[PDB]
Swiss-Prot record:
Function: Pulmonary surfactant-associated proteins promote alveolar stability by lowering the surface tension at the air-liquid interface in the peripheral air spaces. SP-B increases the collapse pressure of palmitic acid to nearly 70 millinewtons per meter.
Note: Pulmonary surfactant consists of 90% lipid and 10% protein. There are 4 surfactant-associated proteins: 2 collagenous, carbohydrate-binding glycoproteins (SP-A and SP-D) and 2 small hydrophobic proteins (SP-B and SP-C).
UniProt gene name: SFTPB
Quaternary structure and interacting proteins, as annotated: Homodimer; disulfide-linked.
Name of the protein this chain belongs to: Pulmonary surfactant-associated protein B
Coiled coil: none
Organism: Homo sapiens (Human)
Clinical condition linked: Pulmonary surfactant metabolism dysfunction 1: A rare lung disorder due to impaired surfactant homeostasis. It is characterized by alveolar filling with floccular material that stains positive using the periodic acid-Schiff method and is derived from surfactant phospholipids and protein components. Excessive lipoproteins accumulation in the alveoli results in severe respiratory distress. Respiratory distress syndrome in premature infants: A lung disease affecting usually premature newborn infants. It is characterized by deficient gas exchange, diffuse atelectasis, high-permeability lung edema and fibrin-rich alveolar deposits called 'hyaline membranes'.
Domain of life (superkingdom): Eukaryota
Residues of the full protein shown: 201 to 225 of 381
Entry's localization field: Secreted, Extracellular space, Surface film
Length: 25
């Protein structure tokens, strides 16, 4: 369900999921 809610803890969980899909070196 893609819902854009402005919350700091939800933004930190989305940044950790993007880093787990694309590896940094």
């Amino acid at each position: 369900f893609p819902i854009p809610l402005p919350y700091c803890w939800l933004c930190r969980a989305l940044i950790k999921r993007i880093q787990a899909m694309i590896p940094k070196g």
